[model samples]
Target: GQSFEQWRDAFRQQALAGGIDAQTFDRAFAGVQPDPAVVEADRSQPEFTRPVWKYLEGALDPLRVRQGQARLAQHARILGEVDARYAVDADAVVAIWGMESNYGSHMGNKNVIRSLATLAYEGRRPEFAHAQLLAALKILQHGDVPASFMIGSWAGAMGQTQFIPTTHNQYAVDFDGDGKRDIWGSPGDALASTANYLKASGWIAGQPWGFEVRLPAGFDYSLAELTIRKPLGEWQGMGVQGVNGGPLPSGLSGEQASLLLPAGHRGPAFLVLHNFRAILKYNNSSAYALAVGLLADSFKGGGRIVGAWPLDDVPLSRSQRIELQRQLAARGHDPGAVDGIIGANTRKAIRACQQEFGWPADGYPTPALLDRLR
Candidate 1:
């Protein structure tokens, strides 16, 4: 409810009380203006909102794969050292490097102080933004990065590997040991920090993140969620095979895996493992983790996805999703809300309705399904 100026002045007092030196506080916050552009950028992020298959298609683009491979070769020694110490695969780290900033070619140019200050003052996510502002100040206080050169994305995610302030404080590594965790200009630090993050997030060294697989005829589509996990041997007993209908890979034969049908049964299916979930901790979306894993696979001469996405029906829009929820509720399915977000409850309702109509009880909502409801 306070003006940006008032908020900044009060936060400056708090930062001073929280061990931030007077000079550091003044230098970091001096002349910092609230960036309206940060608000717009935060509200319009398309990665989480887009349909999964579309997200994967662009994320797994061959051009990106090629570029990732080149970067992997270019930084082979650095990445190898990172993997050797952190026990995370080098290609996976390179894949994140590509995803975050296009191998450092396009790290954002926004001022970190202005962006975090504006977000903290913006009132929607004040607590989180305030915490990140404190962390940014601490980073400056530590002299890891100069205040003037502390630039990052609009939401305050910094460095070549795109770590937010808190994560940088927690997981960033000074790989080259020049006394600064210089993620912006130092490829060694950034890539090693990335590997450290993955390792800390429970990455399994030498494990494949996941692989494409073929489902048996009349496969049980209900088990396609991440929540449903079965041992690989159990899945094999249920007639799941590799993409070409051979035995599942020997490496995964004894471990547990979850079925992922990001585009429902019509699209590609994957048997994902712990490392896949490790990738999810980076961005927390199946499509994002899948893209990262598949891109990492490509660096090792992996093939593209064999199963095709169902391109016949377009994805439902926000308005369409709202309408779908409305229609489902009218039919007594109770999708919880008519909000545009098609979350788990809405998908459950869709599956219930589909089961009623003798359609496949997969929970995905498509334009064709909406038309049938109408």
Candidate 2:
């Protein structure tokens, strides 16, 4: 546990060994000071989650959708090149562009070197920030973007599409071929870089990500787990149908799909395919991936979601979720880790308790559920 100043000096040696020259390290750290705001942001991010329906309500707002559509048109050539070369969907890339930085309008203004250095010195996740700092230093060594202009998010995600320094090193593209992978000012690089990552993560061209579906009466909600990949035939045989209550279409495939009940049984369900999982590799939230897919759909003039949301559902904050898991554990059930996230193990624990109380065993927990658990 070195002081910030001490840690910076110590980090310099590691930086030099990692291929960052002394002059480069000194120049990169010039005028840099620990940003307390960066440290505060790192410690304060909550594990709280919003209901997927509510999340979609904001994520798929008319303004975002319209902006996404416009960007799709404005960047059509670059988008098409990404689609043509990387086989990633243009609309999907535009949706990410919209979500990550508001179509490159609001990339954060913090200095990447300063932010990563500060986080490595003082934030909770030092190893992560340290690695990112090393990568940022290497990025500076490559001279894609200069030290002063290498800005990013509070935690150091950079560029129009917001790749962290490491991700940028791995996936950032020089699409326009000016010999620099400058995602900050280059829309083509950012868009194609995004497509590059998706393709590497297994994107399939010309396939639908997934679609909303309807479930049959007495369908076991427990089966609605992302890891529970079932054959399309098996799901259809078990009475899964399209959201409009029609027979399930036979296209979108690995011939396999995962059932995701993001907001639990009462809300909508999706039969997500490989392409859907590809979006998850960008940002690991079912709601996020679904929003990108729906936004992409909207840009293409596809219909809106047909299923009704369970508006009565309440959101559990991180603390409330921790309490839920705590009470569940104290009551002789395994709620997995005491962390606030309601993961698969936590869900099953909640379901076990719900079934004991003669309530539905869907595993969706609310503030009221926590109250009753006491």
Give the winner by TM-score. Answer: 2
Per-residue C-alpha lDDT of model 2 across residues 208-244, encoded as one tens digit per residue: 8888899998888777777789877788889999887
Candidate 1 local lDDT, residue 365? 82
TM-score of each: 0.94, 0.96
- Candidate 2's C-alpha runs over 4 A off are 47-49, 252-254
Would you give me the overall lDDT of model 1?
A: 0.85
Output the worst ten-in-a-row residue range by lDDT, candidate 1.
42-51
- What overall lDDT goes with each candidate model? 0.85, 0.85
Per-residue lDDT of model 1, residues 1-374, tens digit only: 38878987898889989989999988987788878789887666343256676777687788888898888888888878889999999988998888889889889999898998988888368889999999999999998899888889988899798899999999999998799998998999999999999999989889989899999888867777787789898999999998999798775667878998877778788999989988888878777898888888888889488998877746676667788999999999989967787677887898888888877766778777888887
Error in Å for residue 229 of model 2? 0.6
TM-score between candidate 2 and the true structure: 0.96
